[PDB]
Amino acid sequence: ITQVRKEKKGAGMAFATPEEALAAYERGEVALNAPIVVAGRETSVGRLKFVFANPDEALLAVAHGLLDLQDVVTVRYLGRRLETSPGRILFARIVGEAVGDEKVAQELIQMDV
Amino acid sequence: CPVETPEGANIGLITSLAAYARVDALGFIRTPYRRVKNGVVTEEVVYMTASEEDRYTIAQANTPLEGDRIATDRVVARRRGEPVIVAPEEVEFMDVSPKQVFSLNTNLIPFLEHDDANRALMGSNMQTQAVPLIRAQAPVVMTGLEERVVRDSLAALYAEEDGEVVKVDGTRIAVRYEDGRLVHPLRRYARSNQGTAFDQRPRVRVGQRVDLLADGPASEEGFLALGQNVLVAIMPFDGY
Amino acid sequence: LKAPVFTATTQGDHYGEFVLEPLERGFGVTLGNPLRRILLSSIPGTAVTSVYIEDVLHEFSTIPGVKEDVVEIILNLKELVVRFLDPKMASTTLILRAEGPKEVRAGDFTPSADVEIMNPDLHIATLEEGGKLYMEVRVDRGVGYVPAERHGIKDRINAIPVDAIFSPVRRVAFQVEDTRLGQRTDLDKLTLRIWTDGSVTPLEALNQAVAILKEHLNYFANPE
Amino acid sequence: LKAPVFTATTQGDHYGEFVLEPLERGFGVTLGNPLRRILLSSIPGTAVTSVYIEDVLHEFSTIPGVKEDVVEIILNLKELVVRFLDPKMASTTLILRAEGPKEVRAGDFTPSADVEIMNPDLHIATLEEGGKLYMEVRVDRGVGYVPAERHGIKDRINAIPVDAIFSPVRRVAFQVEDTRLGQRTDLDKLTLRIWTDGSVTPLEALNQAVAILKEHLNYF
Amino acid sequence: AALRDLDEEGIVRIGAEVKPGDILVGRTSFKGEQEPSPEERLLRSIFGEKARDVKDTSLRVPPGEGGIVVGRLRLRRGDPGVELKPGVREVVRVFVAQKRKLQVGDKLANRHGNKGVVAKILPVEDMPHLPDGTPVDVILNPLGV
Amino acid sequence: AEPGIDKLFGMVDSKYRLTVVVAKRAQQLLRHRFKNTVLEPEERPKMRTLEGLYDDPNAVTWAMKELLTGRLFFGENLVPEDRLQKEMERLY
Amino acid sequence: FGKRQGEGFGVDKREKEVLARAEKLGLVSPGKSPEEQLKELFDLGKVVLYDGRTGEPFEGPIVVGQMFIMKLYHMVEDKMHARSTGPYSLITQQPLG
Amino acid sequence: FNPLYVMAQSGARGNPQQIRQLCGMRGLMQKPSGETFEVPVRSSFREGLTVLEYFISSHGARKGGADTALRTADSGYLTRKLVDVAHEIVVREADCGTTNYISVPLFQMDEVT
Amino acid sequence: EIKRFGRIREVIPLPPLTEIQVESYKKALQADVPPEKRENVGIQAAFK
Amino acid sequence: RQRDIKDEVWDALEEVIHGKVVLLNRAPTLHRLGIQAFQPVLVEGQSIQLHPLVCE
Incomplete structure (x- = not known):
């Protein structure tokens, strides 16, 4: 759960998610490449919540028939608007409640690689 | 001689003999088998080196239309040879069977061609202490070599001359209307030297012949059945 | 809905x-x-729990005149099932006096009501020229899988306890x-x-x- | 035992x-x-379902005079929780608006009655000179997890439907x-x-x- | 009772299930190595029993034997058809059996090399249930080979 | 590990000097007189099995917790090793 | 599948999501209904398979089939020991015999 | 994620050179004495060897077992020498005071260049 | 159930496999053989 | 006599095996990481299990 989800969808474009957001959701270009405004297909399931009681929408959507998990690229809220998938979030959440607060694992655990 | 019989403490010192080895005047030096592509098998000892040879690989009615007959002389195997003639063979270019390489114990292995030596080594030794079982479901995939491992080892019994068993079964197999009246008494669970005790249950009634007659320790219908085959599934489970 | x-x-x-x-x-x-x-x-559920041959002491043996053996007949019995048409039944002992050249199926046992046999045939044994297979077998209602630990007493001698698969x-x-x-x-x-x-x-x-x-x-419901 | x-x-x-x-x-x-x-x-359960911010026209925009942005305020609203003191309460529209240089908490919203706010503070947003933050938000009792699929009509135009965690x-x-x-x-x-x-x-x-x-x- | 019940005449009866810590060949030896002890003579007279001159000295089942006997064999002297050790008399020889079943552990190792050990045997309930019954009897996870 | 074991190393200058104190105390904490523990209130180490709550028969655990209450003392002190019997004498 | 398809059913939801795996996973080629996707998945693999303990099927193509499970002589019962002061071997000054 | 042969090769429980063996073809085996054979081995396990490839590859798969097992002949009876020498060495006292010191090299040379 | 996957099965495997033993008490142990013939190899071998 | 107690004794045994560790060893031995100690937690059967990591 961290070996990228890039399944090769192509490279489309939307005027801030109003075009290739619903059309591409039907056929071709899923949740991989494709850039829009700046980010990409990350705009789909914005996991809100906060550093209060872990990302609700995150693990919540994963449990149901939504987030495929296994790191499918998703925007959380944790401590800042990131791109980390709910998969890695679990890891940081496991070591979090384990010892004490993600404050330590956050500055320790990497994200780039 | 095989290349996966030893163990550890004594490597090279403890191996085994080939299936198609030890024949004729073995009293002096070993002598393998070699086919001449024609109905005949010569035994010119191991020192053989006449017109190289070829291992059982791709045949076509005596004269394989391979064009590149996989040869193997001495050490390396110079591509091929192919005398390009309707002659017998390259003096002895034929292994007859791929069982001549590995030991009669290794050839038993089902798909013996997808693992390493060491890997297959341990498994080969497992057939030496597979502790017989009354069940013996016999492994699905099994070479037609075990057909003799049940009779040669005399694990089970035999049937002389004609048939007509009229078996009474129990602990003393009946007789056969072949020549005289001889009752075949089972080993009665007998006794083992490793604390196992093998038994031999029969399989007949009224009369029948061909020529198995009553199995042995870990066997089933003349089929060598050491362990037991059961549906399995590859996957991790909690860490068990 | x-x-x-x-x-x-x-x-x-x-x-x-x-x-x-x-x-x-x-x-x-x-x-x-x-x-x-x-x-x-x-x-x-219900299943076998204890048996008792005749001229045979323990499992590790063989029954003369019978194609099969003690352990054999015992195993086949594990797959036999009986019903208790009465919730007042705790356990019913069964008897089996087989004869000669036959196969001795399951319906050849003791034809007693109160309990039925929903599994005919059930190759139990096949004695011929022996004329001796008198074997007592007890069956009780249990729940789960219980091996030979509840030492099926009864006879108190050679009643070799068989695994239970109630x-x-x-x-x-x-x-x-x-x-x-x-x-x-x-x-x-x-x-x-x-x-x-x-x-x-x-x-x-x-x-x-x-x-x-x-x-x-x-x-x-109520916590602590 | x-x-x-x-x-x-x-x-x-x-x-x-x-x-x-x-x-x-x-x-x-x-x-x-x-x-x-x-x-x-x-x-x-109960949670937010639809919201409407004035001046703004979508979600991927920004509210002038506010440190945070549309998407931001929206996310923080997903954590908010309410309570319906009466079974006969399908939904309940809410209204927000407050001063300028302040960190409009959660108790600053419409001080109704049939509904209560368990969690105080709840960041929300922090506007400054911009004295505008009029945002309509609808709540409704649901069941499990339902993303932006119910549409969240109400206003009909610019009522950007937010995920539901009721x-x-x-x-x-x-x-x-x-x-x-x-x-x-x-x-x-x-x-x-x-x-x-x-x-x-x-x-x-x-x-x-x-x-x-x-x-x-x-x-x- | 544990004696007279499954012993009698000495050797244990054939076809008698015996467990570890029981008698099998209770032989009597007049070998007197330890004479009566001082304060021991009291606990010997206190009870209803007296003294002794043979001691228990028996076989006593070894640390592991829960089965049944198949048959014995008395091989004492007086028989010129038995090459035994000089000065030896009565060489009891019994055979004890025992069913193995299957607990935890042991080596499987098929015919390729993948060898392992039984960890835990979860009763039916769990285990991967095929979409038509027949629950996975054995699970062979990779790692190792 | 041990409940607050790392905190035990900080005090003792050596990891080996700690062990000695752990046992040295356990020798006169349960065997000498079970009524010599500084931890008596609600801090009294106890077990909770099927039965109820009782004091664990093992005293080696008490030492680790007893050498954390800030009390006790270790190191070269009181040469007379036969005086320990005098102090223990008053404790019956 | 013949029995299932003729027993009174065909293709399961939990047996459908598993395909969504191989699909992108590059395992099963996308095209016709789950019928063929479950076919090729059987040739080199096995059916979806589930978990009797948890409750939901193991998300991912798991293999199943009969091979061969033997048993070596070395067990556990006759390969264990335990003692105290009972053991002793005079002259050797050590627990033996 | 489909290929597990790499999931462990990258970092879990797999060897890189162990891959070139299976799907690879590894056959650059050397004679028992010392002389890389002529033609390599037609590995590709999926396809049974020419009955000669395994017998040829075994020559090298022999030293890889007799050497490890021969680690109890001499090498195994050498570790004792190590434990005997350093025996009375124990960290005690407190601050001895020694002048001469050692300067560990931060850079080493390469015989090649 | 016979799904034979063997091609060209010429001469069977050298029987009875256990010939090393036979050629041990038949080549050396010239017991069950009239003393009139037989060379050495075995008893009559080390004997002479 | 292997009377199979399995009654009450298994309880008193817990009090003794409470905070009392045991030394598990591995043969052959290699390096300081060849012994270590854990806390005996009697399970079932006879097989003695341990934590995976320790194998390394």
Whole structure:
């Protein structure tokens, strides 16, 4: 759960998610490449919540028939608007409640690689 | 001689003999088998080196239309040879069977061609202490070599001359209307030297012949059945 | 919706597909799995527990005049099943005086009511020219899997205790479809299917699980 | 013995820690997973469903005079929780607006009545010179998790539908370790913890799964 | 009773299930190595019994034997058809059997090399249930080979 | 590990000097007189099995917790090793 | 599948999501209904398969089939030992015999 | 994620050179004495060897077992020498006071260049 | 159930496999053989 | 006499095995990481299990 989800969808474009957001959701270009405004297909399931009681929408959507998990690229809220998938979030959440607060694992655990 | 019989403490010192080895005047030096592509098998000892040879690989009615007959002389195997003639063979270019390489114990292995030596080594030794079982479901995939491992080892019994068993079964197999009246008494669970005790249950009634007659320790219908085959599934489970 | 249509097509002492239709996306397996769990577990079934040959002392032997052996006849008996048409029965001893050249099926035992044999034939043995297979066997109602630990007394001598497999239900599974009108094709469809009838009707098996499941669900009431 | 000791800790609103001891080897998960599968779902909940911010026209924009942005304020609103003091309350539209240089908390919203706000503060946003933040928001009682699929009409134009988390209960999990208070050390040990408190007490969340789990079984 | 019940005449009866810590060949030896002890003569007179001159000295089942006997064999002197050790008399020889079943552990190792050990045997209930019954009897996870 | 074991190393200058104190105390904490523990209130180490709550028969655990209450003392002190019997004498 | 398809059903939801795996996973080629996707998945693999303990099927193509499970002579019972002061071997000054 | 042969090769429980063996073809085996054979081995396990490839590859798969097992002949009876020498070495006292010191090299040379 | 996957099965495997033993008490142990013939190899071998 | 107690004794045994560790060893031995100690937690059967990591 961290070996990228890039399944090769192509490279489309939307005027801030109003075009290739619903059309591409039907056929071709899923949740991989494709850039829009700046980010990409990350705009789909914005996991809100906060550093209060872990990302609700995150693990919540994963449990149901939504987030495929296994790191499918998703925007959380944790401590800042990131791109980390709910998969890695679990890891940081496991070591979090384990010892004490993600404050330590956050500055320790990497994200780039 | 095989290349996966030893163990550890004594490597090279403890191996085994080939299936198609030890024949004729073995009293002096070993002598393998070699086919001449024609109905005949010569035994010119191991020192053989006449017109190289070829291992059982791709045949076509005596004269394989391979064009590149996989040869193997001495050490390396110079591509091929192919005398390009309707002659017998390259003096002895034929292994007859791929069982001549590995030991009669290794050839038993089902798909013996997808693992390493060491890997297959341990498994080969497992057939030496597979502790017989009354069940013996016999492994699905099994070479037609075990057909003799049940009779040669005399694990089970035999049937002389004609048939007509009229078996009474129990602990003393009946007789056969072949020549005289001889009752075949089972080993009665007998006794083992490793604390196992093998038994031999029969399989007949009224009369029948061909020529198995009553199995042995870990066997089933003349089929060598050491362990037991059961549906399995590859996957991790909690860490068990 | 609300109240679903619980359908059941019992075949009569085997099979018996039970199907539910309207539910909620995320409950088709929430109710199904838990039940099957109970079936292949805590269920008052019946099976052999102790036997007693005749001229044979213990299992490690052989019965003269019989094609099979002690251990053999014992194993085949493990697959035999009997019903108790009376909740007042705790255990019924059975007798088997086989004769000569025959196969001695299952229906050749003691033709006593109170208990039936839903599994004819059952090659138990095949004695010929022996004329001796008198073997006493006890059978009691249990629950689960209990080996040879409850030393089946009775005879108190050579009553070699045989493994117990009281469990009536065996091998179970289910599926979840999706085509129960209502609204939104996101609904589920429970359709469990017991594939066994040890000694209890498929229907009973279900009610049993659901019932026992409640007794264990009531514990989650008053805390501490 | 036969009757297990059902112990519960309960911290107050959140984290309870319910533990059962005596059982049977093969039940610890038989009656532990089914429950947590009802919590995350069918539960009389309540959450945000639709919102409307003036001046703005979508979600991927920004509110002038506000440190945060549309998407930002929207996310923080997903954590907000309300309570309907009357069964006869389908939905309840809310209205927001307040001063300039202040961190409009959660209690600053419409001081209604039939609905209460458990969680105070709740960041929300922090506008400054820009004295505008008029944002209409609709709430509604639901069940499990329902993303932006219900549309959230209301205003009809610019009522950007926000995800719905009307499931008081959130992330949940348990465990099972073999003990031996009774006989063999094969027995199990339940212990299911509900790390959530969306509006209902941890205790009520349990009795609500066990109850609803019964009716569905009574169908047979 | 544990004696007279399954012993009698000395050797144990054939076909008698015996467990570890029981008698099998209770032989008597007049070998007097330890004479009566001082304060021991009291506990010997206190009870209803007296003294001794043979001691228990028996076979006593070894640390592991829960089965049944198949048959014995008395091979004492007086028989010129038995090459035994000089000065030896009565060479009891019994055969004890025992069913193995299957607990935890042991080596499987098929016919390729993948060898392992039985960890835990979860009763039916769990285990991967095929979409038609027949629950996975054995699970062979990779790692190792 | 041990409940607050790392905190035990900080005090003792050596990891080996700690062990000695752990046992040296346990020798006169349960065997000498079970009524010599500084931890008597609600901090009294106890077990909770099927029965109820009782004091664990093992004293080696008490030492680790007893050498954390800030009390006690270790190191070269009181040469007379036969005086320990005098102090223990008053404790019956 | 013949029995299932003729038993009174065909293709399961839990047996449908598993395909969504192989699909992108590059395992099963996308095209016709789950019928063929479950076919090729059987040739080199096995059916979806589930978990009797948890409740939901193992998300991912798992293999199943009959091979061969033997048993070596070395067990556990006759390969274990335990003692105290009972053992002793005079002259050797060590527990033996 | 489909290929597990790499999931462990990257970092879990797999060897890189162990891959070139299976799907690879590894056959650059050397004679028993010392002389890389002529033609390599037609590995590709999926396709049974020419009955000669295994017999040829075994020559090298022999030293890889007799060497490890021969680690109890001499090498195994050498570790004792190590434990004997350093024996009375124990960290005691407190601050001895020694002048001469050692300067560990931060950079080493390469015979090649 | 016979799904034979063997091609060209010429001469069978050298029987009875256990010939090393036979050629041990038949080549050396010239017991069950009239003393009129037989060379050495075995008894009559080390004997002479 | 292997009377199979399995009654009460298994309880008193816990009090003794409470905070009292045991030394598990591995043969052959290699390096300081060849012994270590854990806390005995009697399970079932006879097989003695340990934590995976320790194998390394």
